[PDB]
Amino acid sequence: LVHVASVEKGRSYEDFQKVYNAIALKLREDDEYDNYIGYGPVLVRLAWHTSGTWDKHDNTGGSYGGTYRFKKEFNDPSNAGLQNGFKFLEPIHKEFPWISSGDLFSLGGVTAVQEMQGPKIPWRCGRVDTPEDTTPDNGRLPDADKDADYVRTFFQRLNMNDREVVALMGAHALGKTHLKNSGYEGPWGAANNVFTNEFYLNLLNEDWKLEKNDANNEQWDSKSGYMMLPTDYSLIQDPKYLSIVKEYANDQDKFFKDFSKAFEKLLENGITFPKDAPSPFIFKTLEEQGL
Ligand code: HEM
Ligand SMILES: [F-]
């Protein structure tokens, strides 16, 4: 199967800029959510979980179809907590009903990263809604208590290499883990809603102890109050991952650049862009538009 991108009929850059804007403003205005973290991180996760189902071998899942809107995907245990992101975006969808679900879901992540001072993430449009029968089964998203060979292996199915994996992981600077959702509890860092390389810095410069949490899973905790999933901690256990973690903890700049490529790619996996499609869009932030 091939998924051809198909621009929403007669729409162009500034149409999408308006949708960025709406999302970016609600982000600004509902800022009490999760004890002041806001919606940015949960939108980033939604963007990733809606693309992260892709299977490179047969082209199933992925961001195209917006399948997250159907009961099966929406209630995947791996998706617990994301309801809040969909619930944020539902009113934005009603105001721009002409946008595909795939475009909304993925644009949400791109907006959230920029609005949190991350790099610009070129974004392309033309995900087309597909029917309920195209929804991938549960279980394509990664288990948290696994190791480096598990993470490398898992991410091969997304066509991501070592660099992309580590870059994309740095997204764990945003938000926290929530016991009721995933069986883990605690943020990865302090600058909870600002996109930085704090993730690689905390990985390397904290003294972690392995511990049981109240759900009876183990996680690596620091005296500072931070945590790391075993998959997170695996990135310093693997010598080839360690090297790239060092690079990013060192050069926020090279990380932003790499994350930007990986995210767009992640968000576009599975999609065939016809030869005469529009170039990727780069959207202005609220601050660039004087807010
Ligand atoms: C081995 C790969 C990964 C694993 C095992 C993993 C696992 C998890 C878990 C258990 C949570 C906490 C969920 C909760 O309790 O609310 C989480 C949060 C999060 N993940 Fe990942 N994740 C992975 C990769 C990624 C990627 C590739 C991205 C995006 C590029 C990402 C972005 C986020 C964000 C932004 C949050 C926090 C959401 C919030 O605070 O509500 N993660 N992840
Ligand atoms: F995640």
Whether residues 286 and 183 share a domain: the answer is: no
Whether residues 193 and 49 share a domain: the answer is: no
Whether residues 206 and 279 share a domain: the answer is: no
Mutate to test the pocket of ligand 1, among 172, 174, 188, 231 (most ligand atoms within 8 A of CB): 172
Q: If you measure from the C-alpha of residue 288 to the centroid of ligand 1, how many angstroms do you get, rounded to a whole number?
A: 29
Whether residues 168 and 116 share a domain: the answer is: no
Residue 187 DSSP SS3: strand
Whether residues 13 and 152 share a domain: the answer is: no
Q: If you measure from the C-alpha of residue 57 to the centroid of ligand 1, how many angstroms do you get, rounded to a whole number?
A: 24
Whether residues 166 and 218 share a domain: the answer is: yes
**Counting ligands in written order, which one lies closest to the CA of residue 177?**
1
Q: How many domains does the chain have?
A: 2
Q: Please tell me the distance from the alpha carbon of residue 138 to that of residue 84, in angstroms, as a whole number.
A: 19
CATH of residue 2: 1.10.520.10
Contact 92, 155 (CB under 8 A): no
Whether residues 90 and 154 share a domain: the answer is: no
Q: If you measure from the C-alpha of residue 284 to the centroid of ligand 2, how many angstroms do you get, rounded to a whole number?
A: 26
Whether residues 171 and 87 share a domain: the answer is: no
The DSSP code sequence of 241-268 is HHHHHHHHHH-HHHHHHHHHHHHHHHHH
Would you give the DSSP letter of residue 188?
Answer: S
Whether residues 219 and 287 share a domain: the answer is: no
Paired tokens of 144: 């948290």
Residue that the structure tokens 């931070």 belong to: 226
Active-site residue (options: 49, 123, 208, 220): 49
Burial class for 264, CB neighbours closer than 10 Å (0-12, 13-18, 19+) = middle
Would you give the DSSP letter of residue 139?
Answer: -
Domain that holds residue 172: 142-262
CATH of residue 148: 1.10.420.10
Whether residues 284 and 178 share a domain: the answer is: no
Whether residues 90 and 225 share a domain: the answer is: no
Active-site residue (options: 123, 188, 208, 220): 188
The DSSP code sequence of 4-39 is E----TT--HHHHHHHHHHHHHHHHH---TTTTT-S
Is 49 among the catalytic positions?
A: yes
> What's this structure's resolution in Å?
2.4
Give the residue ranges of the annotated binding site for heme b.
172
User: Phi, psi (5° rounding) for residue 275?
Assistant: -60, -35
Count the Cβ atoms, other than its own, within 10 Å of residue 210: 11
Query: Which of 37, 17, 18 is CA-nearest to residue 27?
Result: 37
Query: Which residues, 6 or more positions from 291, have their beta carbon under 8 angstroms from its beta carbon?
Result: 25, 28
User: Phi, psi (5° rounding) for residue 228?
Assistant: -145, 135
**Counting ligands in written order, which one lies closest to the CA of residue 45?**
1
Whether residues 248 and 158 share a domain: the answer is: yes
